[model samples]
Target: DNEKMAALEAKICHQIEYYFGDFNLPRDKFLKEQIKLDEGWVPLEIMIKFNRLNRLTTDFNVIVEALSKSKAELMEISEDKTKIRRSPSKPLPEVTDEYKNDVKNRSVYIKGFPTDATLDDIKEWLEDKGQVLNIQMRRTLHKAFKGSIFVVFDSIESAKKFVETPGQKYKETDLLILFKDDYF
Candidate 1:
């Protein structure tokens, strides 16, 4: 079905975006080594070998095709459609405490989502409140989903406000919120 492929494409695009996004890239030493090869290009074949993407599609051209239609501006596909890499335009910033704090300040931690809640549920609920940058779902070591998340917003102002507000509710239940830094 077209919808099946569309969903797969969306998932592919999302996974690639996370791989290349500002918060993940600086800390991803494995991908960093891959990107340092051949002017930041990482082969699509190698990318598909990842457990996340491999579970979706093993076809390199599909990844190339999906990424070609990507809107994130986080990656650039090769001319031959055989490799992809982080967009040179969005340079990975220095991994200093300054950059770390900047990211931290714009993030919030929340709990109280129902055990049945999906990531899409959380995303849709939060979308109406602020510009979300990224969402890291808390999970157990064996990969059980925990009813919590660390979500990064567009600004510190938004994150702090989201946490401080007592009006927060989701699924008719009041959510517990805190600054991302406070979670630790």
Candidate 2:
């Protein structure tokens, strides 16, 4: 145990000083989607806090691994761990075809909004392209875009036009637009 901590700290310090170790999970879309479904993995608050540490040194992996092991063990031994096994819960949205079609017709999922981008910035860029009904910019609390967003246009034709464009670019980030239905 002591050796593990000692090694972990050394690795952390070394990683912080050299490589960007802020838990750079493989950027696999399928893996990302799967991870989103597993709510039991780790608390968002805890992840966010670790991310703050990441800002200082890229040495969050050791800490995250420790936390995960701790939680898994806590869930494993009910009596000895002295922690009740609690399945975390959250709300679910009704899956309705009518609502689905509405979303499909009006929305386009995009990936490539710049980190410093705002709704206004997006609208300004798309103003001449089409009328925007709504813009959902997917970004971290630090206002950095992980290259994901949902843009709602006034009409399906507008969505089509944008998608049909050749070699489109948004704030120097190449655009990848998918219909809402195709995205999920």
Candidate 3:
């Protein structure tokens, strides 16, 4: 079982690294992949630490063939939770110019967030530069995230100021910031 555990860990690692390196997975997808696990009985600390490592890796090309395309696509899209939050909306972008318009707003998508965060939480962390437009932290009705959040601003200039740098610390997680393509 120990060897099986190692193999499974390697399998999950390879899968995580494969997706992480590809650059096609959205920030939320990256986060979602991180949250979803089936390794069986690993300690919460090691599991979370493992997820965090994959989330931070920038080199995926060694594991995939379409790195540039993936990054280009990542750069082109908005971190719009409405856009890339799940599977149903996966192809919605290709079908609608409305999605394109959202990205054109040029907001930054804050990743590795504490889902329990509220609009006030985001406002508290990001003040004065701009006002909050929308917040969608409710993954379900029963609870909230104490881990990750996305903050949208009214102006790209302001969003740029917030996201110009990556790896900003927020609680136990480091934020992975991505720009709305129009701003880039």
Candidate 4:
């Protein structure tokens, strides 16, 4: 039945195009149409490193979901109506010369992480060796796909170690890691 429906749809493409002004697609129109919905979604009182966001389709979804979770958590804290303060995350120590020069010389980037993943996630993966320069995983103030994340390592060796190590693999979500050419 599904096959028949797909076949019918395929066969009727020309007719549909004729009615809707033809399938002569333009690049700009397609790019514009690819705009993600989160460009306008605003998050409160949080900043991501921008470079550490997992931007793969699954990873991207995870990041957005995490942002929503964070926002909700913040709201709940606010509504509690008690004066509360967030402590700064525990600072990572400076990289040792052995790990620094041996491995960290090669900076590697990672994509396709679960959206809800935090610094702890990377720290856990990296086995707590190097200092995290920055991590960003929020939507741009007013840009499509601003919800993507960026992550840079203290050195290439650490990044290389991470890529080769164990990764998150739940039945619901799998990661597909990729290296980035520049900060995104």
Candidate 5:
């Protein structure tokens, strides 16, 4: 039993390092200020980080669910409204025009493109929506069918418009279009 617990701790430590190694910030700061207004959150944080590191899906539903649990726990922890909540770990970035522009020029993910669809066909199909700067094709290790693609548009407006377009289908498959950031 002791050995099992040690192995679990070692795994958690590795996960913490793998996720936070590139982050140029102090870990203590997150506990002090970042994780706001939640009691008994150590378990929640561990569960969230563990699930995140082992993610098989592209969506962040696990994080969303964890947040919900944390919110519920907060309600249980706080009986009075006078409780002081901790501030966010770091200040969120200001939404400047440059940031908006960068978001507009972001890449979008596209799924359900026919395996036979050429890059030229995709570019031409997307021409009316926006100026396509580049197309990246994704494939499984086995290089099976069902080609996924990443499309880089000249502007965010174009990406939005592409998604808004009704009846978007390629070879009878409904194309799943999402911002690159949202998809992965």
Candidate 6:
């Protein structure tokens, strides 16, 4: 019973932390707006409504379990255990030209997959290469898959290696790898 509770808390904390992490927070407009309401606080009632939290079972006690067990100082539970917030001392990283370039520097671009390929098809096919954090399939304005991928790798060296290694192929199809900056 205790381990199950530990399991539950870890899942909730991990997902919540994932929401607030650098790579996700800038992209999550709703959460960004929510964080602006009153000293960067959030209601458990509000957070429990998110779809991912739904999978972990959202209720007052579960949220309390998650936040109270968390080791994060001042990324804290409220006095009543009903709300949470990032510490005011920790501000979000600004999105400047420097930041965007840093992100792009960690990304790679590739084309020459079958146009019909699904994201799962590409991800499963790509793991031996490096630690990929995100995959952005280049799509047409009409929303058709365009047979190219922009991937965010966990490290610059990994992205560099993926691009410079010669004779890369996606099955029988030759893969064209380039730095995302080059694609830009």
Per-residue lDDT tens digits for candidate 3, residues 36-144, read 5522112223323444334533333221222222422321211221111112223323525875555446556665666666655665666554654444342545565
Candidate of highest lDDT: 1
- Candidate 5 local accuracy as lDDT? 0.52
lDDT of all predictions, in order shown?
Answer: 0.83, 0.53, 0.44, 0.37, 0.52, 0.81
For model 5, name the residue pairs that clash. 34-89, 104-156
* Candidate whose TM-score is highest: 1
For model 2, the superposed segments whose C-alpha errors exceed 4 Å read 1-96, 141-144
lDDT of 5 by residue, 1-184 (tens): 9676454444433333333321212344554343344542233334343453454222234333322344222211123322222223423346689865575457788888888777567766775677565666787778754568887766777777886777778768888877787786
TM-score of 6: 0.64
How far in Å is the alpha carbon of 73 misplaced in model 5?
59
Task: Quickly count the clashes in candidate 1.
Answer: 0
What TM-score quantifies how close candidate 2 is to the native fold?
0.43
Could you give candidate 4's per-residue lDDT for residues 8-67 as a string of tens digits?
433233221211121111222532232223231212212121222212122323333332
Q: Which stretches of candidate 3 lie above 4 Å from their native place?
A: 1-103, 138-148, 180-184
* Off by more than 4 A, model 5: 1-105, 142-146
lDDT comparison, 1 vs 2, better candidate: 1
Error of 4 at 89 (Å): 25
Clash statistics: count for each candidate: 0, 0, 11, 20, 2, 0
Q: Per-residue error at 73 for model 6, in Å? A: 6.9
Q: Every model's Cα RMSD, please? A: 3.4, 14.7, 17.8, 19.1, 15.9, 4.4
Pairing residues by index, what is the TM-score of model 4? 0.30
Least accurate stretch of 10 residues (summed lDDT) in model 3? 77-86
The TM-score-based order of candidates, best leading, equals 1, 6, 2, 5, 3, 4
Candidate 6, poorest ten consecutive residues by summed lDDT: 67-76
Candidate 2 achieves a global lDDT of 0.53
